[PDB]
Amino acid sequence: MNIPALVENQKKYFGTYSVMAMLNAQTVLDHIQKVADINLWFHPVMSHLYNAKNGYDKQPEKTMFIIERLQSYFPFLKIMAENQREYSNGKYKQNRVEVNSNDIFEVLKRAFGVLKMYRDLTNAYKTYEEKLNDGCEFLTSTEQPLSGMINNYYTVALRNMNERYGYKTEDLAFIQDKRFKFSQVNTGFFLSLQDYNGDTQKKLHLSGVGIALLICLFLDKQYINIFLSRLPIFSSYNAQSEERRIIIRSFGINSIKLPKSNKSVAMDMLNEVKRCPDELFTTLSAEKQSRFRIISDDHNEVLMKRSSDRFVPLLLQYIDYGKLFDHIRFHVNMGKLRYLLKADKTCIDGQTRVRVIEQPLNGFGRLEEAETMRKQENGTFGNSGIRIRDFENMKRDDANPANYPYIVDTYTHYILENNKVEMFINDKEDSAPLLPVIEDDRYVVKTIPSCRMSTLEIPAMAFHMFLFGSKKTEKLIVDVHNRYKRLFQAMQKEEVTAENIASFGIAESDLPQKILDLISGNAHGKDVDAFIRLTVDDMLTDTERRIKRFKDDRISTGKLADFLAKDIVLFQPSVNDGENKITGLNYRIMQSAIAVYDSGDDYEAKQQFKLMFEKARLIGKGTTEPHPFLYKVFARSIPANAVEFYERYLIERKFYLTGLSNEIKKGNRVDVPFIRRDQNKWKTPAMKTLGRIYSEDLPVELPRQMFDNEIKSHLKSLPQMEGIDFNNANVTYLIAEYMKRVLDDDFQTFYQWNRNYRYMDMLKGEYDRKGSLQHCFTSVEEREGLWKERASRTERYRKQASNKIRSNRQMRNASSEEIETILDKRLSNSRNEYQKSEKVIRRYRVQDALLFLLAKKTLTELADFDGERFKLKEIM
RNA sequence: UCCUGCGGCCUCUACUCUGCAGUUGUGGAAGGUCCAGUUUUGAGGGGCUAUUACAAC
RNA sequence: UGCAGAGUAGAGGCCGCAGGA
Ligand SMILES: [Mg+2]
Numbered sequence A: 001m002n003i004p005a006l007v008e009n010q011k012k013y014f015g016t017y018s019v020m021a022m023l024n025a026q027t028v029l030d031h032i033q034k035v036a037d038i039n040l041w042f043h044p045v046m047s048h049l050y051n052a053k054n055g056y057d058k059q060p061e062k063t064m065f066i067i068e069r070l071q072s073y074f075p076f077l078k079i080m081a082e083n084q085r086e087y088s089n090g091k092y093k094q095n096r097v098e099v100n101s102n103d104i105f106e107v108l109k110r111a112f113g114v115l116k117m118y119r120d121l122t123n124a125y126k127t128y129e130e131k132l133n134d135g136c137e138f139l140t141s142t143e144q145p146l147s148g149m150i151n152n153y154y155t156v157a158l159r160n161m162n163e164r165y166g167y168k169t170e171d172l173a174f175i176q177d178k179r180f181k182f183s184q185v186n187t188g189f190f191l192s193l194q195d196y197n198g199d200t201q202k203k204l205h206l207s208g209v210g211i212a213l214l215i216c217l218f219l220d221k222q223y224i225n226i227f228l229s230r231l232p233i234f235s236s237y238n239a240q241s242e243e244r245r246i247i248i249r250s251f252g253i254n255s256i257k258l259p260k261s262n263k264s265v266a267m268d269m270l271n272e273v274k275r276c277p278d279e280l281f282t283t284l285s286a287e288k289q290s291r292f293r294i295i296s297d298d299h300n301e302v303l304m305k306r307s308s309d310r311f312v313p314l315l316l317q318y319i320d321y322g323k324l325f326d327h328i329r330f331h332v333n334m335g336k337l338r339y340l341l342k343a344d345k346t347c348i349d350g351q352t353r354v355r356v357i358e359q360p361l362n363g364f365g366r367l368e369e370a371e372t373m374r375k376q377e378n379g380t381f382g383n384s385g386i387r388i389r390d391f392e393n394m395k396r397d398d399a400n401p402a403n404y405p406y407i408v409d410t411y412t413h414y415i416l417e418n419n420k421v422e423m424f425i426n427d428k429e430d431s432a433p434l435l436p437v438i439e440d441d442r443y444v445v446k447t448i449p450s451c452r453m454s455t456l457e458i459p460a461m462a463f464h465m466f467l468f469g470s471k472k473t474e475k476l477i478v479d480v481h482n483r484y485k486r487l488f489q490a491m492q493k494e495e496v497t498a499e500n501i502a503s504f505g506i507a508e509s510d511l512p513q514k515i516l517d518l519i520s521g522n523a524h525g526k527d528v529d530a531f532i533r534l535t536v537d538d539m540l541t542d543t544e545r546r547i548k549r550f551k552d553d554r555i556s557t558g559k560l561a562d563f564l565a566k567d568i569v570l571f572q573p574s575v576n577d578g579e580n581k582i583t584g585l586n587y588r589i590m591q592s593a594i595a596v597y598d599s600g601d602d603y604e605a606k607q608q609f610k611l612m613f614e615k616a617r618l619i620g621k622g623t624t625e626p627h628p629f630l631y632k633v634f635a636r637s638i639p640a641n642a643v644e645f646y647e648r649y650l651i652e653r654k655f656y657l658t659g660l661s662n663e664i665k666k667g668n669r670v671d672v673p674f675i676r677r678d679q680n681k682w683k684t685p686a687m688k689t690l691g692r693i694y695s696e697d698l699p700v701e702l703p704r705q706m707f708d709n710e711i712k713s714h715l716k717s718l719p720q721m722e723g724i725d726f727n728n729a730n731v732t733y734l735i736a737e738y739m740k741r742v743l744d745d746d747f748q749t750f751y752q753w754n755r756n757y758r759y760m761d762m763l764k765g766e767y768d769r770k771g772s773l774q775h776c777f778t779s780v781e782e783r784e785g786l787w788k789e790r791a792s793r794t795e796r797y798r799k800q801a802s803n804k805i806r807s808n809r810q811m812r813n814a815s816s817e818e819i820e821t822i823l824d825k826r827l828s829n830s831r832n833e834y835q836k837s838e839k840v841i842r843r844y845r846v847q848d849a850l851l852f853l854l855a856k857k858t859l860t861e862l863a864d865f866d867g868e869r870f871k872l873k874e875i876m
Numbered sequence B: 001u002c003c004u005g006c007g008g009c010c011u012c013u014a015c016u017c018u019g020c021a022g023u024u025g026u027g028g029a030a031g032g033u034c035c036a037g038u039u040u041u042g043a044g045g046g047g048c049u050a051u052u053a054c055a056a057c
Numbered sequence C: 001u002g003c004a005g006a007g008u009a010g011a012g013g014c015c016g017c018a019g020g021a
Helices: A005-009 A011-036 A044-050 A060-073 A076-092 A101-122 A137-165 A169-176 A208-217 A221-228 A242-250 A262-273 A278-283 A286-290 A311-322 A367-374 A455-468 A470-492 A513-520 A528-553 A557-570 A584-596 A603-615 A642-665 A687-697 A708-717 A731-741 A758-764 A780-788 A790-807 A816-860
Strands: A293-295 A301-303 A328-346 A352-364 A406-408 A420-425 A437-439 A443-445 A451-454
Touching: A005 A011, A005 A101, A005 A208, A011 A044, A011 A060, A011 A101, A011 A208, A011 A221, A044 A060, A044 A101, A060 A076, A060 A101, A076 A101, A076 A137, A101 A137, A101 A208, A137 A169, A137 A208, A137 A242, A169 A242, A208 A221, A221 A242, A262 A311, A262 A816, A278 A816, A311 A328, A311 A367, A311 A455, A311 A816, A328 A367, A328 A470, A352 A443, A420 A455, A420 A470, A451 A455, A451 A470, A455 A470, A455 A708, A455 A731, A455 A816, A470 A687, A513 A687, A528 A642, A557 A584, A557 A642, A584 A603, A584 A642, A708 A731, A731 A816, A758 A780, A758 A790, A758 A816, A780 A790, A790 A816
Parallel strands: none
Antiparallel strands: A293 A301, A328 A352, A328 A406, A328 A420, A420 A451, A437 A443
């Protein structure tokens, strides 16, 4: 057999990249050896596989690791191992349905053997090699089988092209239609992977292109491109052709996979402040909205708009990567633990389902350090031992106990919910991440945060950090936290009085009202009876609203089933610490069951529907905690469908609540399932009991305006701030005064653009020819003045608006109340939307000032860079 | 002096797969919402509210 | 009816690297 001419003519390239291919392979094999604590087919990792089915496996955990990781690092091995199974079934007349270690070993033995051969030939001026002799063992056993394997591999690789790059039949036909002749392999095809290579025995070997393909399985995409570009393997397709790109992509599609910063965060911050906040974008004219839109080269619109407020996560990354806090660490989530409670759980619809329980893996540390701890080399979580399930593992509703517990793979992120930031205060510096311990493979032992801060406090914290330094900032948070702790310890000793409350160093406006009540001698619980009376009335009114709306409308059964499932559980009495009420899976089933319920007045189907509520122990004889009125819904007859069920449910609800109202009116005591007299809400608070809950059970709720006194003392010392009344100056105000007076800066120009609000339309009172209300775009000065005149202007608005209701025929004979109510709600909602929107945009301004300031500080102290000249006003 | 290819970061869109959607307790300094001769200075006042979290099923 | 995670793809911004004329 002759060396292919392509190989002989491009020897320096085949030489170079064959060596690179073999080194890359060894690298993977070496990595796997190290992580698992185990002539490349004699590598320890490959020996292991060779011997793995020599009797009963003594190291199954190692075998399985090797098989899994080999298929990760060598993606082509999934295809080739599958072909090797099918081959062996042929050879030994078997029906093995599953790939095993023998398949994997054989594929890689051959691939490595041929790669080694060509490596040796192409990296030597002259070596007469025995392995090229026609009919020899090497050719018959290794090389010729490999050529057929490679050819079958490529069939599948081209199929993968469709999935991966969206190529169509027409795109790939220049290869797919010409590979095989009529079925033979068309060795005359320009991209043929097999040839006779002047073998007198006339057996198919790897062609030059075939050898290039083998090599490229073991290269990075960068080197695939450098290598193939040197080779005349593209017939007449030119550098810019799609066909050339298809060929190259086909040679990389399943190839080897080889095993944030201060600067990056700074640049993430600057790219945040150039984007439009979403609340602002809504209010802008189409012209100004257009200013945030780009058309790309490929004629695609791309929108520079914030999808969420990333101020706080950006700030947390800034602190973490900067190593700016010695003691404080933020609350991170690192995935979920899933454990199998029961493989066969009978549900309230009488169908059996796997019952899997989840727990979040919450902890405290710097995002990078926590992330390094989360995923061990051996693919377990932290120091737990428990496996992290990978993307390749796809086993839905898996019922096998051996597969549990496992941990969902999720990158460490900060937990940022309910506008809060939770943190843990370490006594010592350079503490390790606080990962949760797992107990009995089932409980995730989490840690109550030290303290919790409003995300609305983060601007002032940032500002304090910028003026004083992160270490002084941190000492203040820690000192505030320790003041609250001293207070709560004194409460537990009953040593807090009106006479000494000031000594604790906490302003009245930052003490819980219950402490203030307790020292003033005015401690009281809420009035449960008042609450019952009010709740019953509110709910009766709502029930009638829903009855009317439904008759009028006659509709999403999904929407109906949401209402019904919530309400059914609301009215279910609790016993035994709430252990009797409907649990998550059964709740999902009940709600879905309702949404799709539609007997054809089929008796069995009706019985089945009723039975569900019997099994949930809501209706039926012998039930101890029944729903108070649901059983009336099924008295006389079962409703035929979800819509009938909703109607009957609401009527029965109305009768129940009317009864309650009537008993309340007689001065009698009533009880509802979901109001519980034994809850602390209803009792008088005690100093000592409340002391302990505040110290031990909850995070410290950090006060607003923690940093104000220190911020204001600093700024008072600056001469540029001389003419500021610090007695009417909040931190939002002072950030902007700092930017203007000390830095000669201002906010981004797009915060001066005119905005639209329905409420301001109503207050402006301007109509078109047809009589519709106009969408104005106002300045802030205009809105200031409309708002001053809102009483008069609201009067005008209502007068006109009411007339326009009675002009329309549907609401023509409408009561004074009906109209007045419709308008009341219209103006309230609009006014509230406008006020909140304007407040939030004013926060976005000063948040952007702070990101800009911090980013600029990072980059100033980096690089061959100077940036004293740069200003937020220039950002667009 | 630019074009082709590769890696990292962040965002958006499409697709697949896998999962979740409940209870009780505690907690209204904080968060949400509503009222006003309140704020364009998440500043302040009054009312209503378990929403983050943690524990247990 | 809604939410979450991972993978892949595509489009885009910024940074870094390689190669050919
Ligand atoms: Mg305050």
